[PDB]
From a paper:
This study focuses on TmFtn, a naturally dimeric protein consisting of two antiparallel four helix bundles, as shown in Supplementary Fig. 1. By tuning two contiguous dimeric proteins to interact in a fully or partially side-by-side fashion through protein interface redesign, we can render the self-assembly transformation of such dimeric building blocks from the protein nanocage to filament, nanorod and nanoribbon in response to multiple external stimuli.
We made a mutant named [name] where Asn147 was replaced by aromatic phenylalanine (Phe) residue to create π–π interactions, while Glu112, Glu113, and Lys114 were replaced by three hydrophobic residues Leu, Ala, and Leu to decrease the electrostatic repulsion and increase the hydrophobic interactions between two adjacent dimers at the same time. To confirm this idea, we examined the [name] self-assembly behavior in solution concerning Ca2+ and [name] concentrations. To obtain detailed structural information on the [name] filament, we tried to crystallize this protein and eventually obtained qualified single crystals suitable for X-ray diffraction. Further crystal analyses reveal that two adjacent [name] molecules have opposite orientations, forming another interface along their C and D helixes. Besides the designed noncovalent interactions, Leu112 and Val119 also produce hydrophobic interactions, which is unexpected. We believe that the cooperation of these noncovalent interactions and metal coordination along the inter-building-block interfaces promotes the formation of the filaments.
Numbering used by the authors:
A (entry chain A): 3 to 164
B (entry chain H): 2 to 164
């Protein structure tokens, strides 16, 4: 029932979620190497969340009578020059995902595909919220300047993510 | 007491092979879901998650021994097979090779006098053999069905119940 161009768009986004999951796990490998157990735990939770979103795209594609094709996953970066540098990359990554989602929303609307528009709305909202969470983290980091006190507070807080 | 670099390399290689395995199994789910076998598809998704849990077990052991993990590119998996049996044959061939891989690391760790790593791999060795034999039992059932839709579907319901 879903148009091939819209199915292709959802399949591209599914693969982007997978890569996104992988980047975060790679961010985990960096924080774990640097001894920040709380940051690494948060990244691992984020990787798990992105995987659940990919699976949401997976099952929606099959619900609309399409088919999922899994593409190569490129090697993610594994090193950053500081906690701030890592979260800068996450924000840059996340802004791009949001843009991609917006563009699929436009493609579905031109196709007059109501279901797909509705489906993507929840992800639009989740992406906006994630972007802001990363921004608030970077604001805290920039305002702390170097003070390790704030960096350990944030390791503790994020290490509690359920 | 931190792990040697070669034992580190091999565990990290195995970590990445558990990641590909998890992705391969998910790709098999895309095939069964497209062919209309919800039960087979469900089993492959469970297996893909389990392989991720194995990858993360390697992940945390490497850091416990003061090593680090490097994630490599994940190759595109096959997305199509010529039949239910063709898919499960590739699954068995994959798991067979993983079994030899685990035993290879086990000998390398012993050679390196790394009793901690040898003891860690024991659980995986033991579980790798069990699940290689579970995949062969499935594949054997489908060959003894030959054509029979009736038995293929009963397999689909069976694997569809995996918790
Ligand atoms: Ca994402
Ligand atoms: Ca293709
Ligand atoms: Ca646009
Ligand atoms: Ca979230
Ligand atoms: Ca198993
Ligand atoms: Fe996502
Ligand atoms: Fe995201
Ligand atoms: Fe395994
Ligand atoms: Fe396996």
């Amino acid at each position: 029932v879903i148009s091939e161009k819209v199915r292709k768009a959802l399949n591209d986004q599914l693969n982007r979620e997978i890569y996104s999951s992988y980047l975060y796990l790679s961010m985990a490998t960096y924080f774990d190497a640097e001894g920040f157990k709380g940051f690494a735990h948060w990244m691992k939770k984020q990787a798990q969340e992105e995987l659940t979103h990919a699976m949401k795209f997976y099952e929606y594609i099959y619900e609309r009578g399409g088919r999922v094709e899994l593409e190569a996953i490129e090697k993610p970066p594994s090193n950053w020059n500081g906690i701030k540098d890592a979260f800068e990359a996450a924000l840059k990554h996340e802004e791009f995902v949001t843009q991609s989602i917006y563009n699929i929303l436009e493609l579905a609307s031109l196709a007059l595909d109501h279901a797909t528009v509705s489906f993507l709305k929840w992800f639009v909202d989740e992406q906006v919220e994630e972007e802001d969470q990363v921004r608030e983290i970077l604001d805290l980091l920039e305002k702390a300047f170097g003070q390790m006190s704030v960096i350990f507070q944030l390791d503790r807080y994020l290490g509690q993510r359920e």
